Amino acid sequence: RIPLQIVRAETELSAEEKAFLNAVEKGDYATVKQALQEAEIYYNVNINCMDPLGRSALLIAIENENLEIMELLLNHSVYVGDALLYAIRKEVVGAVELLLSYQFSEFTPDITPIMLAAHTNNYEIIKLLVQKRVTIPRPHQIRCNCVECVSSSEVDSLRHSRSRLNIYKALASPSLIALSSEDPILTAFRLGWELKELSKVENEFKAEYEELSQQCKLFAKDLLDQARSSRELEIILNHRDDLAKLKVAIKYHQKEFVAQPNCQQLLATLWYDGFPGWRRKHWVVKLLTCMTIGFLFPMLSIAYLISPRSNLGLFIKKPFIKFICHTASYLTFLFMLLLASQHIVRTDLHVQGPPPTVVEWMILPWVLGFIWGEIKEMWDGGFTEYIHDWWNLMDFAMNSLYLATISLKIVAYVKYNGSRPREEWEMWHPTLIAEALFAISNILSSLRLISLFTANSHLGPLQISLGRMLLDILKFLFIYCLVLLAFANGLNQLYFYYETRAIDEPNNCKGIRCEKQNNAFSTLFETLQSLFWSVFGLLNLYVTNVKARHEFTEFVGATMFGTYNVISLVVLLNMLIAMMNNSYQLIADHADIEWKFARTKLWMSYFDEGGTLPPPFNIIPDSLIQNQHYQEVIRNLVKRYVAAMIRNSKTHEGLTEENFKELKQDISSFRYEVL
Amino acid sequence: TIPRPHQIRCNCVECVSSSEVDSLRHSRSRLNIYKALASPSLIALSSEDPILTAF
Amino acid sequence: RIPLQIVRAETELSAEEKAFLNAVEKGDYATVKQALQEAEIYYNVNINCMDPLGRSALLIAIENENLEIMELLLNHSVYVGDALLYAIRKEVVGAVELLLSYQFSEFTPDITPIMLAAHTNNYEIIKLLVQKRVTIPRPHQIRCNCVECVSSSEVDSLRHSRSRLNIYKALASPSLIALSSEDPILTAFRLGWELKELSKVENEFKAEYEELSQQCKLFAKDLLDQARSSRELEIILNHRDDLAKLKVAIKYHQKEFVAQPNCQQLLATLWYDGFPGWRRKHWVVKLLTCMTIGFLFPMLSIAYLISPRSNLGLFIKKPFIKFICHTASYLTFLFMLLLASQHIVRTDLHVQGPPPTVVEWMILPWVLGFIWGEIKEMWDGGFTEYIHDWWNLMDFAMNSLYLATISLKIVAYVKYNGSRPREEWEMWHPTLIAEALFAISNILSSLRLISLFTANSHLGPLQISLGRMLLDILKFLFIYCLVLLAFANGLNQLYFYYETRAIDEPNNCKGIRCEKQNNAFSTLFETLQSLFWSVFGLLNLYVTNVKARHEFTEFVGATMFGTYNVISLVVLLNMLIAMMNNSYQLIADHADIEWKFARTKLWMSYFDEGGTLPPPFNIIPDSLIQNQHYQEVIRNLVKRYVAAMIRNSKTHEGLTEENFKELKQDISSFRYEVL
Ligand SMILES: CC(C)CCC[C@@H](C)[C@H]1CC[C@H]2[C@@H]3CC=C4C[C@@H](OC(=O)CCC(=O)O)CC[C@]4(C)[C@H]3CC[C@]12C
Ligand SMILES: CC(C)CCC[C@@H](C)[C@H]1CC[C@H]2[C@@H]3CC=C4C[C@@H](OC(=O)CCC(=O)O)CC[C@]4(C)[C@H]3CC[C@]12C
Ligand SMILES: [Ca+2]
Ligand SMILES: [Ca+2]
Ligand SMILES: [Zn+2]
Ligand SMILES: [Zn+2]
Ligand SMILES: [Zn+2]
């Protein structure tokens, strides 16, 4: 039971001011005139009177989009400050032209008319403003330590951040870009890249910068979709500041630009150089052509080596043929690797240092070619780009393992000369180490074949999606490792008092890899291995029993093991499944764009003339006119895009408002004529 | 003025009698009073600490 | 290169007819008059001329909602057939009144004006039509063999079905129900039930009948939400054609009606009879009150038996107290069942026919009370309702098992007198069979405790959701069983040649329940058991080996087992998981309504005065004025609902059309006045 009052009271204006505001709002070309005369003579009305909701007479007239009252008030020298911004926001060209013809605010004090027009993206008002030689400030580098930036960040961080965001939002306007830039596509590429990089430095305002970068990418794509001819498309794609613009787009991660249908058709035409009407043929004949071209890989290569200008020697220069030949060569290498571990070719397993066999002699040139190709690619093409592939890491590991295997084999051959039973060799015998490294490198080289899946229309998107989920798998791995370490520490602390020697165990075997598992929690390493193997159910339940009858200790150990099993197998795995599902739901939307970007990147690596020969055979020893053409095509594209966007801007609300205003104007004119 | 309701757990005779005669009317009246009190415009107009009042 | 022509040409009308139609469409009170005069005199115009798009002049005027031309044409005796339907569909009251004042069509020939008005759900037009003593046909029973129905279904099934659907769609109109029914709530209940039952007989038009039933349910609920007082709510809920209307709603499956907040408050007030301000107390004190009331269950019952009118004897008549007492009694029975299988109370396991122990003597009265209560409930309350619970099946199985156990114990006690080692008893000893049946009944009785979860705010919805998924689990069971039978047949056919006797096996054990598993696929029963147990990984891999060296047979058996494992564990289980997820996604939306319906059904079973005592103690031996009140409250509710729906019918499109038409009319009037 407490009354309600007004705490922050507003100082009301007099009846004269209220009547003046009412007349201004209603619209009376004569009553407002006589009110202004009275204000001039007797000062009964304040010319600068303000509505309690901060709405002066000029603002009321602007919101009423009637220009006669505004012109009269301008002639009467009313306070005109901060009215051009209201006109711009209301998007009224006539009023904007009128004010351009010469406390409390709804706009921050850093906003300029040109910036506000750019935020609105109105081409007609932006052009009108830019016609009067306006400028826009440009911000400092993302990581800048200059005194002016440091002082600004030290006095008003909120103001600094808001000003930077406003400037970038103005600069990212498609209409401003089209009006003021000479290379709109390149400008959009660079601006999108800069905004994407800035979003992670200003982590608080991340979504705004993300949306600005998306806007720039959409503008570039939509500008590309306005091409009407193959000649125009080639002029756009081949412009050098052979497909220089496409390479720049790939560098700047313009996936929607690259995956556009007109670009994909050009790329496919370049890809199928020697097979006109490839999509006309049946899948059976295409498959048979693939097999026949694959089997002739040793030829077409010797021909290219002995006669590049010959008809046969020019066949391997086509991208699809080159890809098929490289694939066939890699498959042959893998088949020899398979042949290495067979009974047919490898015998006499009793020699300490064995000379290389025929299969190893055949294998060596492939390894040399792989290493030479990796080094040559890394030298020619950029060192910093070589590491942003995530497959070159596998290549490096595989080649390092092969080099270590060769070195260990040579060392063993030099050091050892004779025979000895394998059962009495030491643990660290060079032959044993070389065999282990060879097996690991075989696994890696066989797993490398995944990267060829992106060339297929059915397996490529699936491979991209799996590669996208791998990161979140890596995210869960951390929590799992922490839980595993905690429980391993506890179990080892409990059980380390009951260690036994291998002598007293059956068969003199110690650990969990024996037929009767024992000493599962005697050391930290063994405890970690046991807790890892219990995830798949390969650890038996009698490993929690000690030889003595310590029932309390055995029960505590069993309860520890059961709690670990519950936490690991009932909770963490199901949470992993749930978040896998959530990730795949979002990933499945953009699978096509990512797959086409990946396939374009894969195709573009076979276009150049470097590294034509497969690894087995690769170790044997005017500008102005182009600028005018680009400018003409850009003019046409910008005109078409602007016209299309203007015709799209026709909306029901705008049309209804325009018709209502026009009908009101005509009715007023007819009433005045009658009167 | 606007009436203000009793504590969430109140045993006063007036609350008990009201809940014993017309529970539907009592609940509807309480909900209407709280819906009126939770108005942003009313808060901004009549409160001196709108943030604390909203909290 | 083939030209395009017109195949189904329309016979065009003459220039006179085209001019007449143009004048009618444009609107000319004098030009149309002189055209009609010319048609009368020289017959230059056809009064019945039709637009090529089937649009006569009267239809054009109706779509123009100008009544002067329609009245003039009616005075001129133009073909007026099938125009009232167009007026009704356009929903123009003035035109409808005008035509009511006295080839090609867009309406099927079975549609009447009243049916069309009911389809539109316009209260103003429905009332206007019903004021003139109109009727609507009513259809025959869902399963009717009368000659007229058989002949109609034998001549035109499409026409018959369309007519039935149209009649039901007209009858299911909320405005028609409110206008013409004396008990709208009961009418909505019955109509929704009938439509729901009809949807599964007309399986082709299932969705239409489902939507009609949903419409009826929504109407009944929305009518209920218009109560403003507890007295009105009690009048509505207690009306008998003690909560008769609520019981009818429960019988007709009106979940949204029952789960409404005003009804739930009344039910909670009835439920907490002896605890005013129950929700005011803390959860700790509420819990402690629950425990104390539970422990005093033997008392409050003897008090009710020896003095029902006493202050102590009237406590058990409250529903919450009765529920707590029954729960405590059941928990005591389960605790005695737990005590049955302990070392403290049961000894001397060597007697063939043993006399009952003290725990069994204590157990027997509970079983007798359970059986008596089941029989009494089944007699008093309806036999056909007793089977639609799906818990009474568990009750019946449990009580049958207890009866069989008692009978077998009595038979064994009568037949056997002496002692014998248990190891030399036969397979079918009555004591062994009775023990097995007792254990199974113990499992069932312990599992019965699930039904008490619906009383809790956290476990109830979860239990309802699981019970909803059980049906789809049952759906997958069929496919799994078929696959299992196929593979069992194949494996038994392959392996039945290598059966071995138990004598030659170690420990003289035969089957897969031995320590060394053998004869896994020797018989069909054993093959089925092995293939069942392989789902959980409890079958070892050496069971596919025969004693002889038949490598082809062993490999074929291993491949069969591997194919079965892949199909069962990699495909079917993952599909089950996927469809579980899909089912839960839809189930999670309406969990609250279903849970509240279930809790209301559970609460209502403790309101009546029959079966007050728990099973241990239950074996010891005017209408007119109510009608006027209901009619008044129904009048108020219908008026409020109609007013609310009318105020909700205000839409932007309708308001804009009305304002445009009114402005056009006023402009025309002003122009005529000026002229
Ligand atoms: C699962 C087992 C059988 C793998 C055996 C290894 C190789 C025989 C496979 C592994 C990946 C395969 C490659 C995966 C995808 C492609 C792309 C494919 O190109 C297309 O499909 C082009 C037409 C299109 O775009 O659809 C040509 C075959 C090739 C190189 C495949 C050749 C055969 C490869 C090397
Ligand atoms: C998992 C183990 C511990 C089960 C042991 C068996 C019994 C001790 C449990 C099983 C189900 C329980 C019942 C489940 C739900 C309820 C409803 C509950 O009622 C409310 O919560 C009312 C208030 C509300 O609506 O939230 C009162 C206890 C009771 C009967 C529980 C009493 C104790 C029961 C019989
Ligand atoms: Ca590489
Ligand atoms: Ca029952
Ligand atoms: Zn700076
Ligand atoms: Zn109070
Ligand atoms: Zn009939």
SS (H, E, C) C111-150: CCHHHHHHHHCCHHHHHHHHCCCCCCCCCCCCCCCCHHHH
Three-class DSSP category at A351: strand
Residues C258, C249 contacting (CB under 8 angstroms): yes
Residues C151, C142 contacting (CB under 8 angstroms): no
* Torsion angle defined by CA atoms of residues C95, C100, C105 and C108, in that order, rounded to the nearest 10 degrees: 120
Q: How far is CA A22 from CA A33, A45, A199, C560, C665, in A?
A: 13, 13, 48, 93, 31
Which among A340, C158, A662 is positioned nearest to A670, based on CA atoms?
A: A662
Three-class DSSP category at A76: coil
Count Cβ atoms below 10 Å from residue A599 Cβ, excluding itself: 21
Tokens of A310: 């010959």
Tokens of C261: 């907040």
Which position has the token pair 């297929």? A456
Tokens of C671: 């122009």
- Kindly give the distance from the C-alpha atom of residue C273 to the centroid of ligand 6, in angstroms, as a whole number: 21
User: Could you tell me which residues are beta bridge partners of residue A419?
Assistant: A351
List, in order, residues 6 or more apart from C242 with CB less than 8 Å away.
Answer: C607
Tokens of A95: 């009023």
At residue C4, what is the residue type?
L
The annotation status of A149 as a binding-site residue, yes or no, is: yes
Annotated binding site of C: 140, 144, 146, 149, 374, 377, 392, 395
Buried b (16+ CB within 10 A) or exposed e, B29-52: eeeeeeeebeeeeeeeebeeeeee
Question: According to the entry, how was the structure determined?
Answer: cryo-EM
Tokens of B55: 């909290």
Residues A55, A15 contacting (CB under 8 angstroms): no
The Cα A449–Cα A675 span in angstroms is 89
Which position has the token pair 């009826």? C216
Closest chain B residue to the Cα of C268, Cα to Cα: B23
Q: Which of residues 202-231 of C touch B (CB under 8 A)?
A: 227-231
Which among C526, B1, C577 is positioned nearest to A581, based on CA atoms?
A: C577
Q: How many CB pairs under 8 A join A and B?
A: 18
- Protein residue with its CA nearest to atom 2 in ligand 2: C449
Terminal alpha carbon distance of chain A: 59
The Cα A72–Cα A61 span in angstroms is 11
Which among A122, A133, A128 is positioned nearest to A99, based on CA atoms?
A: A128
The Cα C92–Cα A670 span in angstroms is 34
The Cα A45–Cα A50 span in angstroms is 11
Q: What share of chain C is helix, strand, coil (3-state, %, to 5)?
A: 65, 0, 35
Beta strands in A149-235 (DSSP E): none
User: What's the gap between Cα A117 and its chain centre?
Assistant: 30
Which among A580, A575, A477 is positioned nearest to A532, based on CA atoms?
A: A477
Q: How far is B25 from chain C (nearest CA, A)?
A: 6
Annotated binding site of B: 6, 10, 12, 15
DSSP letter for A13, please.
Answer: P
Residues A310, A303 contacting (CB under 8 angstroms): yes
- Kindly give the distance from the C-alpha atom of residue C367 to the centroid of ligand 4, in angstroms, as a whole number: 13
User: Could you tell me which residues are beta bridge partners of residue A2?
Assistant: B2
Using CB atoms, which residue from A4, A6, A7 is nearest to B1? A4
With a 6 Å cutoff on the Cβ, whether C455 touches ligand 2 is yes
At residue A419, what is the residue type?
S
The Cα C63–Cα C43 span in angstroms is 26
Using CB atoms, which residue from A1, A2, A7 is nearest to B48? A7
Which among C184, C170, C114 is positioned nearest to C639, based on CA atoms?
A: C184
Q: How far is CA C562 from CA C111, C231, C512, C516, C527, in A?
A: 65, 71, 18, 21, 15
Angle made by CA atoms C384, C385, C387, in degrees to the nearest 5: 80
Tokens of A486: 């905690």
Which among C665, C646, C652 is positioned nearest to C65, based on CA atoms?
A: C665
Q: Do B3 and A1 touch (CB under 8 A)?
A: yes
Q: Is B50 on the interface with A (CB under 8 A)?
A: no
Count Cβ atoms below 10 Å from residue C326 Cβ, excluding itself: 18
Resolution (A): 2.6
Half-sphere exposure of A616 (CA within 13 A, CB side): 19
User: Could you tell me which residues are beta bridge partners of residue A351?
Assistant: A419
Count Cβ atoms below 10 Å from residue A546 Cβ, excluding itself: 14
Residues C252, C192 contacting (CB under 8 angstroms): yes
Which position has the token pair 């005695």? C336
Count Cβ atoms below 10 Å from residue A258 Cβ, excluding itself: 22
The Cα A345–Cα A361 span in angstroms is 12
Count Cβ atoms below 10 Å from residue C137 Cβ, excluding itself: 13
Annotated binding site of C for Zn(2+): 140, 144, 146, 149
Which among A77, A120, A125, A121 is positioned nearest to A102, based on CA atoms?
A: A77
Three-class DSSP category at A595: helix
List, in order, residues 6 or more apart from A149 with CB less than 8 Å away.
Answer: A140
- Radius of gyration of the CA atoms of chain B, in A: 14
Tokens of A481: 């490792």
Q: How far is CA A220 from CA A188, A191, A232, C104, C126, in A?
A: 6, 11, 16, 54, 59
DSSP letter for A42, please.
Answer: T
The Cα A612–Cα A620 span in angstroms is 13
Tokens of A618: 């690769």
Count Cβ atoms below 10 Å from residue A484 Cβ, excluding itself: 17
Three-class DSSP category at A513: coil
- Kindly give the distance from the C-alpha atom of residue A459 to the centroid of ligand 1, in angstroms, as a whole number: 9
List, in order, residues 6 or more apart from A636 with CB less than 8 Å away.
Answer: A226, A232
The Cα C615–Cα C373 span in angstroms is 7
Which among C229, C233, C220 is positioned nearest to C263, based on CA atoms?
A: C233
Q: Helix H segments across A416-459?
A: 430-447
List, in order, residues 6 or more apart from A126 with CB less than 8 Å away.
Answer: A114, A117, A118, A173, A175, A176, A179
Residues B55, A17 contacting (CB under 8 angstroms): no
Which among A108, A117, A166, A159 is positioned nearest to A137, based on CA atoms?
A: A166
Which among A327, A188, A283 is positioned nearest to A634, based on CA atoms?
A: A188
Residues C113, C90 contacting (CB under 8 angstroms): no
Q: Helix H segments across A380-429?
A: 383-386, 392-415
Residues A422, A349 contacting (CB under 8 angstroms): yes
At residue A87, what is the residue type?
A
Tokens of A332: 């042959």
Which position has the token pair 């001011």? A17
- Protein residue with its CA nearest to atom 10 in ligand 2: C449
Count Cβ atoms below 10 Å from residue A166 Cβ, excluding itself: 19
- Kindly give the distance from the C-alpha atom of residue C391 to the centroid of ligand 4, in angstroms, as a whole number: 7
The Cα C466–Cα C478 span in angstroms is 19
Which among A58, A68, A61, A115 is positioned nearest to A88, based on CA atoms?
A: A115
Residues C87, C63 contacting (CB under 8 angstroms): no
Three-class DSSP category at A141: coil
Residues A90, A62 contacting (CB under 8 angstroms): yes
Which position has the token pair 């009978």? C407
C511's torsion region: left (phi>0), alpha (psi -120 to 50) or beta? Answer: left
| H/E stretch holding C326 | helix C319-340
Half-sphere exposure of C671 (CA within 13 A, CB side): 6
Residue A478 dihedral angles phi and psi, to the nearest 5°: -65, -50
Q: How many CB pairs under 8 A join B and C?
A: 21
Count Cβ atoms below 10 Å from residue C586 Cβ, excluding itself: 9
Terminal alpha carbon distance of chain B: 22
With a 6 Å cutoff on the Cβ, whether A631 touches ligand 1 is no
Tokens of A610: 């470097």
Tokens of C476: 């997958």
Q: What share of chain A is helix, strand, coil (3-state, %, to 5)?
A: 65, 0, 35
User: Could you tell me which residues are beta bridge partners of residue B2?
Assistant: A2
With a 6 Å cutoff on the Cβ, whether A449 touches ligand 1 is yes
The Cα A246–Cα A227 span in angstroms is 15
Supply the CATH classification number for the domain C15-269.
1.25.40.20
The Cα C84–Cα C90 span in angstroms is 10
Give chain B's largest Cα–Cα span.
Answer: 38
Which among C572, C578, C543, C537 is positioned nearest to C560, based on CA atoms?
A: C543
